[PDB]
């Protein structure tokens, strides 16, 4: 699947990828195709994958960190690992 009609890929000032919906005049960090392809929760994830709405990013001062677009937050803790230690208990 390619981008649905009306959607255009673009790059932010530092090259970070986002998506433009011209039909609704809005922008999003999330690829609309993720709404089909991404696993729904951390339970649905295998290997190193991230559920719908989560992004890993890099910061020169702190290293890798995580972005939850579902809640518009960022965190240093690895949510895949949090979820493992939670279901171990």
């Amino acid at each position: 699947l390619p981008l649905p009609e009306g959607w255009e890929e673009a790059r932010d000032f530092d090259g970070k990828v986002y998506y433009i919906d011209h039909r609704n005049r809005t922008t999003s960090w999330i690829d609309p195709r993720d709404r089909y392809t991404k696993p729904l929760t951390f339970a649905d994830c295998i290997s190193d994958e991230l559920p719908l709405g989560w992004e890993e990013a890099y910061d020169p001062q702190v290293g890798d960190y995580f972005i939850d677009h579902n809640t518009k937050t960022t965190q240093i803790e690895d949510p895949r690992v949090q979820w493992r230690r939670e279901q171990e208990h």
Partner: peptide, 20 residues
């Protein structure tokens, strides 16, 4: 330091205007 704060997507109209 500590983790970067959340970054909002760029504004649609702003993006359309900045293509000049």
């Amino acid at each position: 330091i500590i983790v970067p704060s959340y970054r909002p997507t760029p504004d649609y109209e702003t993006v359309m205007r900045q293509m000049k």
